Structures are given as structure tokens and as C-alpha cells.
mmCIF file of C-alpha atoms in Angstrom:
data_model
loop_
_atom_site.group_PDB
_atom_site.id
_atom_site.type_symbol
_atom_site.label_atom_id
_atom_site.label_comp_id
_atom_site.label_asym_id
_atom_site.label_seq_id
_atom_site.Cartn_x
_atom_site.Cartn_y
_atom_site.Cartn_z
ATOM 1 C CA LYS A 1 -6.115 7.359 -11.090
ATOM 2 C CA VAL A 2 -8.070 4.124 -10.675
ATOM 3 C CA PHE A 3 -5.805 1.343 -11.981
ATOM 4 C CA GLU A 4 -7.117 -1.674 -13.819
ATOM 5 C CA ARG A 5 -6.055 -4.942 -12.148
ATOM 6 C CA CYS A 6 -3.454 -6.229 -14.650
ATOM 7 C CA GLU A 7 -2.166 -2.754 -15.464
ATOM 8 C CA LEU A 8 -1.312 -2.372 -11.759
ATOM 9 C CA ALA A 9 0.274 -5.856 -11.558
ATOM 10 C CA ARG A 10 2.652 -5.080 -14.409
ATOM 11 C CA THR A 11 3.509 -1.681 -12.953
ATOM 12 C CA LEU A 12 4.284 -3.166 -9.513
ATOM 13 C CA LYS A 13 6.469 -5.844 -11.101
ATOM 14 C CA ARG A 14 8.450 -3.264 -13.088
ATOM 15 C CA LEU A 15 8.914 -1.287 -9.867
ATOM 16 C CA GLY A 16 10.464 -4.351 -8.178
ATOM 17 C CA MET A 17 7.686 -5.369 -5.791
ATOM 18 C CA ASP A 18 7.629 -9.047 -6.691
ATOM 19 C CA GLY A 19 9.155 -10.839 -3.715
ATOM 20 C CA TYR A 20 10.251 -7.630 -2.026
ATOM 21 C CA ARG A 21 11.136 -8.773 1.539
ATOM 22 C CA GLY A 22 9.424 -12.122 0.856
ATOM 23 C CA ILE A 23 6.164 -10.485 -0.252
ATOM 24 C CA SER A 24 4.663 -11.855 -3.457
ATOM 25 C CA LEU A 25 3.202 -9.575 -6.130
ATOM 26 C CA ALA A 26 -0.171 -11.290 -5.445
ATOM 27 C CA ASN A 27 0.006 -10.117 -1.825
ATOM 28 C CA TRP A 28 0.767 -6.508 -2.810
ATOM 29 C CA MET A 29 -2.174 -6.701 -5.226
ATOM 30 C CA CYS A 30 -4.441 -8.034 -2.477
ATOM 31 C CA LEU A 31 -3.360 -5.196 -0.165
ATOM 32 C CA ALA A 32 -4.039 -2.429 -2.756
ATOM 33 C CA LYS A 33 -7.390 -3.986 -3.655
ATOM 34 C CA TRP A 34 -8.747 -3.844 -0.132
ATOM 35 C CA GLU A 35 -6.979 -0.682 0.968
ATOM 36 C CA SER A 36 -8.044 1.614 -1.887
ATOM 37 C CA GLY A 37 -9.629 -0.430 -4.641
ATOM 38 C CA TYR A 38 -6.539 0.491 -6.740
ATOM 39 C CA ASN A 39 -7.283 4.224 -6.431
ATOM 40 C CA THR A 40 -4.282 6.553 -5.991
ATOM 41 C CA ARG A 41 -6.349 9.464 -4.640
ATOM 42 C CA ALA A 42 -7.888 7.374 -1.867
ATOM 43 C CA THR A 43 -7.600 9.152 1.521
ATOM 44 C CA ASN A 44 -8.979 8.011 4.865
ATOM 45 C CA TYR A 45 -9.035 10.151 7.966
ATOM 46 C CA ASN A 46 -8.889 8.214 11.243
ATOM 47 C CA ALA A 47 -10.950 10.306 13.699
ATOM 48 C CA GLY A 48 -9.683 8.291 16.658
ATOM 49 C CA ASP A 49 -5.967 9.109 16.444
ATOM 50 C CA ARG A 50 -6.105 12.038 13.995
ATOM 51 C CA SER A 51 -3.939 10.428 11.334
ATOM 52 C CA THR A 52 -4.803 10.015 7.674
ATOM 53 C CA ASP A 53 -4.100 7.102 5.278
ATOM 54 C CA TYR A 54 -2.957 8.143 1.791
ATOM 55 C CA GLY A 55 -3.029 6.636 -1.646
ATOM 56 C CA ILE A 56 -3.165 3.289 -3.303
ATOM 57 C CA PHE A 57 -1.524 1.572 -0.302
ATOM 58 C CA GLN A 58 -3.266 3.689 2.370
ATOM 59 C CA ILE A 59 0.023 4.808 3.829
ATOM 60 C CA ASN A 60 -0.351 6.327 7.307
ATOM 61 C CA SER A 61 0.735 9.897 8.146
ATOM 62 C CA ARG A 62 2.030 9.083 11.611
ATOM 63 C CA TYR A 63 4.961 7.063 10.256
ATOM 64 C CA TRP A 64 5.586 7.045 6.514
ATOM 65 C CA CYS A 65 4.729 10.484 5.171
ATOM 66 C CA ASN A 66 4.414 14.030 6.534
ATOM 67 C CA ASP A 67 1.150 15.985 6.261
ATOM 68 C CA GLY A 68 1.745 18.535 9.042
ATOM 69 C CA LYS A 69 -1.556 17.984 10.835
ATOM 70 C CA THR A 70 -0.855 14.556 12.410
ATOM 71 C CA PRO A 71 -0.031 14.572 16.186
ATOM 72 C CA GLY A 72 3.071 12.668 17.288
ATOM 73 C CA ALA A 73 4.026 12.202 13.646
ATOM 74 C CA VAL A 74 7.384 10.738 12.666
ATOM 75 C CA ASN A 75 8.860 10.876 9.148
ATOM 76 C CA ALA A 76 10.540 7.538 8.494
ATOM 77 C CA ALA A 77 10.042 7.831 4.731
ATOM 78 C CA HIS A 78 10.584 11.679 4.589
ATOM 79 C CA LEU A 79 7.931 12.155 1.886
ATOM 80 C CA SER A 80 5.108 14.679 1.789
ATOM 81 C CA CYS A 81 1.799 12.771 1.943
ATOM 82 C CA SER A 82 0.882 14.731 -1.205
ATOM 83 C CA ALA A 83 3.323 12.551 -3.201
ATOM 84 C CA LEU A 84 1.107 9.532 -2.438
ATOM 85 C CA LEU A 85 -1.947 10.984 -4.244
ATOM 86 C CA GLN A 86 -0.243 11.275 -7.677
ATOM 87 C CA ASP A 87 -1.139 9.107 -10.672
ATOM 88 C CA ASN A 88 2.440 7.936 -10.856
ATOM 89 C CA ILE A 89 2.914 5.412 -8.024
ATOM 90 C CA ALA A 90 6.718 5.392 -7.785
ATOM 91 C CA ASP A 91 6.698 7.311 -4.481
ATOM 92 C CA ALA A 92 3.875 5.219 -2.996
ATOM 93 C CA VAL A 93 5.914 2.118 -3.888
ATOM 94 C CA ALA A 94 9.087 3.446 -2.298
ATOM 95 C CA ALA A 95 7.049 4.274 0.839
ATOM 96 C CA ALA A 96 5.462 0.828 0.912
ATOM 97 C CA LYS A 97 8.922 -0.754 0.596
ATOM 98 C CA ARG A 98 10.180 1.332 3.534
ATOM 99 C CA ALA A 99 7.136 0.390 5.638
ATOM 100 C CA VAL A 100 7.749 -3.355 5.220
ATOM 101 C CA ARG A 101 11.407 -3.025 6.197
ATOM 102 C CA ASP A 102 10.165 -2.818 9.789
ATOM 103 C CA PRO A 103 10.010 -6.272 11.478
ATOM 104 C CA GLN A 104 6.180 -6.283 11.174
ATOM 105 C CA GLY A 105 6.290 -6.437 7.408
ATOM 106 C CA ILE A 106 3.024 -6.557 5.491
ATOM 107 C CA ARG A 107 1.167 -7.405 8.728
ATOM 108 C CA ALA A 108 1.202 -3.717 9.602
ATOM 109 C CA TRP A 109 -1.957 -3.272 7.509
ATOM 110 C CA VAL A 110 -4.786 -4.975 9.397
ATOM 111 C CA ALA A 111 -6.714 -5.194 6.148
ATOM 112 C CA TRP A 112 -3.956 -7.560 4.937
ATOM 113 C CA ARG A 113 -4.451 -9.871 7.928
ATOM 114 C CA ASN A 114 -8.228 -9.864 7.490
ATOM 115 C CA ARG A 115 -8.493 -10.491 3.764
ATOM 116 C CA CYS A 116 -5.199 -11.665 2.316
ATOM 117 C CA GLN A 117 -3.220 -13.529 4.941
ATOM 118 C CA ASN A 118 -3.348 -17.336 4.700
ATOM 119 C CA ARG A 119 -5.635 -17.120 1.655
ATOM 120 C CA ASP A 120 -5.424 -18.057 -2.035
ATOM 121 C CA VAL A 121 -4.474 -14.687 -3.555
ATOM 122 C CA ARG A 122 -3.521 -15.974 -7.025
ATOM 123 C CA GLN A 123 -6.714 -14.429 -8.321
ATOM 124 C CA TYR A 124 -5.178 -10.953 -8.030
ATOM 125 C CA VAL A 125 -2.519 -11.601 -10.698
ATOM 126 C CA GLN A 126 -4.063 -14.327 -12.844
ATOM 127 C CA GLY A 127 -4.109 -13.513 -16.539
ATOM 128 C CA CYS A 128 -1.842 -10.468 -16.201
ATOM 129 C CA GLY A 129 1.271 -11.899 -17.816
ATOM 130 C CA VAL A 130 3.465 -11.382 -14.754
#
């Protein structure tokens, strides 16, 4: 599923992402925009370390989900990476919440540092009624 901007904002809010660990809804929106373009079936194989990023939040298989084919893979979230390619994003959200409970926080995603960090991200939630 490719989410429309405001539809995603409302969904994330209902799922309790607004201000989760100090992270604004606008920041979560910015992350999803650049990671997958709000597409839940987005997958990205990293040829360099043999891991794959899954879903709307591009959650990595070495730490937050198990896909069986990733070397040195840990399962901090305990989810199958398959759960992060569904149309329903409840599992992707729970995984994202777990990921930011590490001291790094949202900075774990380099895309966040490059295009969201220290920027005006209001644009991602403007007009959505959240």
C-alpha cells in the first residue's frame, strides 16, 4: 500500500507515534517519506553487508526483524520481516518504536540525518488535522 500523506499522519497519530520518545509526528512523517515514499512493500537489499531494509520505515533485518538470510542477525523486535510488508502498519510501528528505544533514537536512520534533522518538517503534517 502507498499511503497518502495525511492518511498516514492520522494513522501514525492513532498508533501513538506523536512525541514517542521525544519524536514529533512530523519527524516520523519525514522519515517515512524519504525511506519508502510511504510505501509498505518497499524493500532494499544492501549488497555490502547482506541485510535488507523492509517496509514503510525501512527497518533493517540485522536488528529489528528476522528474515533468515541476514548474517550476524539479531532479533531485538522478534518479528518476521514479512510482517513489515503488510498494508496494515501496526507491526512496522511497533518495530519502529522498539528501534528508537536504543540510545541512538531516530538518528539510526542516516536518511533522517540527511533530510529531516535540523530542518523545518512542518510541511509533512500541514493540513492533515493532526
